[PDB]
Amino acid sequence: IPEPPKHKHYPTPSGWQPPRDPLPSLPYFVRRSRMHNIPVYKEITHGNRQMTLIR
Amino acid sequence: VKKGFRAAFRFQKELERWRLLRCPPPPVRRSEKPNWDYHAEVQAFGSRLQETFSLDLLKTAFINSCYIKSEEAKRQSLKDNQELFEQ
Amino acid sequence: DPVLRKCELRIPVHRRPVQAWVESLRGFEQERIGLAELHPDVFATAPRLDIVHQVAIWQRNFRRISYANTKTRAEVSVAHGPRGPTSYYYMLPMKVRALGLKVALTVKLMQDDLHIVDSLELPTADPQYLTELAQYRHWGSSVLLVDLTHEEMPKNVVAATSGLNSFNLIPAVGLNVYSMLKHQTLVLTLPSVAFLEDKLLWQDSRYTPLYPFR
Amino acid sequence: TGRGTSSRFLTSVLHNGLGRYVQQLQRLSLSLSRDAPSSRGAREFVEREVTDFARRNPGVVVYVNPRPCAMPRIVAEYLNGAVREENVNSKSVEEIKSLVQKLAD
Amino acid sequence: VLVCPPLRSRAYTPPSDLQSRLESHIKEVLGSSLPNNWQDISLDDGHMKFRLLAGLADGLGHAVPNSRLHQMCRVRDVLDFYNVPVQDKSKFDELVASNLPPNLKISWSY
Amino acid sequence: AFVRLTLPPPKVVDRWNEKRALFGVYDNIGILGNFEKHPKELIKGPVWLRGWRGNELQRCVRKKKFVGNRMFIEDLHNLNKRISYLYKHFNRH
Amino acid sequence: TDRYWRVQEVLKHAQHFRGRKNRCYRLAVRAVTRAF
RNA sequence: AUUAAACCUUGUACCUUUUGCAUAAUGAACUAACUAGAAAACUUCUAACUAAAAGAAUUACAGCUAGAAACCCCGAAACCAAAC
Q: What residues have CB less than 8 Å from C80, skipping those under 6 apart?
A: none
F67 neighbors F47 (Cβ within 8 angstroms)? yes
Give E68 to chain B, closest Cα distance, Å. Answer: 48
Shortest-distance nucleotide from A47 CA to C1': H43
Q: Which residues of A touch C12 (CB under 8 A)?
A: 31
Q: Which of E55, E2, E7 is nearest to E29 (CA)?
A: E55
Chain B contact for D16, CB < 8 A?
no
Does B touch F (3+ CB pairs < 8 Å)?
yes
The secondary structure of chain G in percent helix, strand, coil, rounded to multiples of 5, reads 75, 0, 25
Distance G18 CA to H59 C1' (A): 75
Q: What angle do CA C160, C161, C166 make, to 5 degrees?
A: 125
Give C144 CA → H54 C1' in Å.
Answer: 33
The secondary structure of G20-34 as a DSSP string is GGGT-HHHHHHHHHH
Q: Is B72 on the interface with D (CB under 8 A)?
A: no
Q: Which of C64, C150, C52 is nearest to C101 (CA)?
A: C52
Estimate in Å the CA C79 to C1' H35 gap, whole number.
Answer: 9
Q: Given in angstroms, what resolution was this structure solved at?
A: 7.3
Query: Quick check: B11 contacting F, CB < 8 Å?
Result: yes
| C177 neighbourhood in chain F, CB within 8 Å | 24
Q: How far apart are CA C27 and CA E4, in angstroms?
A: 9
Q: How far is the CA of E34 from the C1' of H3 (A)?
A: 98
Q: Check C196 against F43: CB less than 8 A apart.
A: no
Q: Which residues contact E48 (CB under 8 A, 6 or more apart)?
A: E29, E30
Protein footprint on strand H: which nucleotides are under 7 Å from a CB? 1-2, 13-14, 30-33, 35-40, 43-58, 62-63, 65-67, 72-74
- Judged by DSSP in three states, E34 sits in coil
Chain G closest-CA separation from residue B24 CA (Å): 20
Q: Are D60 and D9 in contact (CB under 8 A)?
A: no
Cα dist. C180→A47, D40, D87 in Å? Answer: 44, 27, 37
Nearest-nucleotide field for C95 (CA, C1'): H48
Using alpha carbons, list the distances in angstroms from residue B76 to B64, B67, B71, C115, F80: 18, 14, 8, 67, 94
Strand H–CB D7 distance below 7 A:
yes
> Which residues are bridge partners to D66 per DSSP?
D32
Q: Measured over all CA atoms, what is the biggest interatomic distance in chain A, rounded to whole angstroms? A: 45
What is C53-98 written as a DSSP string? HHHHHHHHHHT-EE------GGG---TT---S-EE------HHHHH
Contact residues, chain C, for A26 at CB < 8 Å: none
Flag residues 121-160 of C with CB < 7 Å from strand H. Answer: none
The DSSP element (H or E) to which C193 belongs, if any, is: helix C190-202
Separation CA C192–CA C100 (nearest Å): 18
Residues 2-21 of G with CB under 7 A from strand H: 3, 7, 20
**Which protein residue lies nearest to nucleotide H53, measured between its Cα and the C1' atom?**
C208
- Helical ranges in chain E per DSSP H: 18-30, 46-60, 66-69, 75-83, 91-96
- Distance, in Å, from the CA atom of C127 to the CA atom of C140, rounded to the nearest integer, reads 16
Rounded-to-integer distance, Cα F1 and Cα G23, Å: 15
Contact check, Cβ <8 Å, C32/E54: yes
